Design a protein around this ligand. Structure first.
Ligand SMILES: [Cl-]
Ligand SMILES: [Cl-]
Ligand SMILES: [Cl-]
Ligand SMILES: [Cl-]
Ligand SMILES: [Cl-]
Ligand SMILES: [Cl-]
Ligand SMILES: [Cl-]
Ligand SMILES: [Cl-]
Lengths: 210, 210, 210, 210
């Protein structure tokens, strides 16, 4: 039994994690901006960047499922990291981030990331860059127990809950079909598994179907 | 002349469509979130999902160049089909969608699509599958005069405007030199031609430069 | 300890299998056209299509690594099957074929094969088609204990012997990197494993690295 | 005028090269396996691997458009480099190779190549890697005046002959409209231009239509 806080729990990914974590038996606090649509026990209706340490004290882990509402608010991904670091560094609390797949390295050389390939679609670049900047900023946070959780390339909100996912690392990975996809449901399962049985501190993991 | 409404007329695709339609002497209304940058002289400042039945009445045809490019919003392609069907079913108003080439069939059996083949780039799959689910759902709407207009595999924004294009059906098609290519401007000529010379009602067509 | 015959043992794939099988301790007969370069025990210098039943009697399994020397002799792949069937059908002897990857199905629907995709390179089609026709002819051989062994897409003669391969089935498969490659050495290992520990009778298996 | 030898002059690439070179008034010798179908007026009926040092003497430049397209023969790209180096090292005879676009670097760091990216089609990898190993080995030959000439990603046989092309270096380059395209005829103009205006000795260059 853990006490978890989920930022932006009204988001599609956020409530996916809430619903999964609740099912596991953990007591979940939803930190939201509007009325709570999630299955969460307690609600803190507050603006993300107005959070204090006293808001995040008394949690085993804090999971940010923050997603920029507008393209000009995309830089808030980085500002959120800076904020959360200010609030959680020094403490032993875990800070998990629902990340992007664009920042995954293409191979073991770890010189180029998916984001940087000539064929990476223009319309994805703004979010992918913000999520990449987000991850780059986390690596400089020495006294923060962070874990960046990259989803698959194809991340599907109401995708089928298969129950069978693959845990990978810093490098882009596919299943046996050469495909990189995962549902929000299966992703939540993998993320909560890393909460219950979590090796990976101050590093990024990745999740995918099958 | 006809009376046309274009959703997302500020985008590159929609704007090329509006500009082509206007110089041919059509009455064009732009349905956009922000300031109208297209050559449409009539504006309706709403997004799709609050358009009423009255908003879309009195039009000869409605062209959706709508786009969404985040994991959360990618399913809005199909959800927009639900909306537009609700607002236009029963009426004889034509409904055209700017689609993708990924859903095109590789051969005459019409089973395997381009996005199904192992050489189809993984990074193109989020958008391709979203647009494919869009077409799949659109085929259901039997009380809607729909036309899905797939571009070429290389859909070039701001590409050279050649006067020539090839109209094909549901099968993936290349020109005499074997390439699948079309600029936005040429695609616009093809789409508007289809509006002026209506044939393919409740059908998917494809366009490519000759 | 098995008694194996390898057709075209002087070929790069052929001697790969011979050298591997010899190492395992089996007694290998090389059926070749010129001087024996393989490590094989006994040699039958004879033209393939002049083989008789008395040439192939007294073998636990016969492995054909036949490769067409000229593009106009590519149809000999099919003729070889017809010949081997005539020689081995009725007997309990296993007949393994070093096949191609082009005939692998793209997905579970099993309607389209890699060979048939729009992007499959023209220069590969003649061999791929002959190897596909080869496999199609085998399926009609009811009283033949055949096993078609497809290699990976990238099949490399002097590739590194990793020792770690994946056994797959009728459907195209990749490793965790989304890559389909294998060395001749690793392929030989997998093929001889199917000889020693062989489930798969009257069906096709596929092999690949990692 | 110059004295040129072209290996595999019967192939589509080599023939376009020979035809371009001849009409410019160069003395062209075709080194081919079979009857010379190119416009070369001098013929040497051998394949590469039996050419002697005397066979390749007295030429200003030697252009290899050699191709191999089976798993067994694909490594002959690199083996031909060994041969041609043996026959031409020490001499000041230029040696040009018709290469591939797959080995082109994606950015200025010159690490990741196109064939290294996860979107690079799996079916193109056998030939791309073979040609990449070819370039890698060719860089070793310091006593050889070599020039590797990469085409565009879309190398169109029998494509339209536009008078315009873009010469680039080792970095993957697209034109103003963002496409990477070149016909055989345009590539031939570029290659022959390089012969007439020698600059890039011991270098890899790339060509694409403007
Ligand atoms: Cl689904
Ligand atoms: Cl890793
Ligand atoms: Cl505005
Ligand atoms: Cl059709
Ligand atoms: Cl190797
Ligand atoms: Cl299977
Ligand atoms: Cl001849
Ligand atoms: Cl350069």
């Amino acid at each position: 039994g853990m006490k978890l806080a989920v930022i932006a729990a009204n988001g599609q990914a956020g409530k996916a994690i809430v619903e999964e974590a609740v099912k596991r038996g953990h007591e979940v606090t939803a930190i939201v901006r509007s009325e709570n649509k999630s299955q969460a026990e307690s609600i803190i209706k507050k603006d993300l960047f107005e959070l204090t340490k006293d808001d995040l004290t008394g949690f085993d882990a804090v999971i940010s499922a923050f997603g920029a509402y507008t393209p000009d608010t995309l830089p808030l991904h980085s500002k959120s990291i800076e904020l959360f670091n200010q609030l959680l560094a020094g403490t032993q609390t875990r800070f998990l981030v629902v990340g992007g797949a664009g920042s995954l390295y293409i191979d073991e050389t770890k010189t180029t990331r998916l984001l940087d390939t000539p064929d990476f679609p223009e319309e994805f670049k703004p979010l992918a860059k913000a999520q990449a900047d987000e991850l780059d900023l986390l690596r400089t946070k020495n006294n923060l127990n962070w874990t960046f959780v990259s989803p698959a390339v194809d991340f599907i909100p109401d995708g089928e809950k298969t129950g069978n996912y693959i845990l990978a690392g810093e490098i882009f990975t596919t299943n046996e079909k050469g495909i990189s996809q995962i549902s929000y449901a299966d992703y939540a399962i993998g993320l909560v598994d890393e909460l219950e049985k979590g090796h990976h501190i101050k590093e990024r993991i990745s999740l995918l179907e099958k």
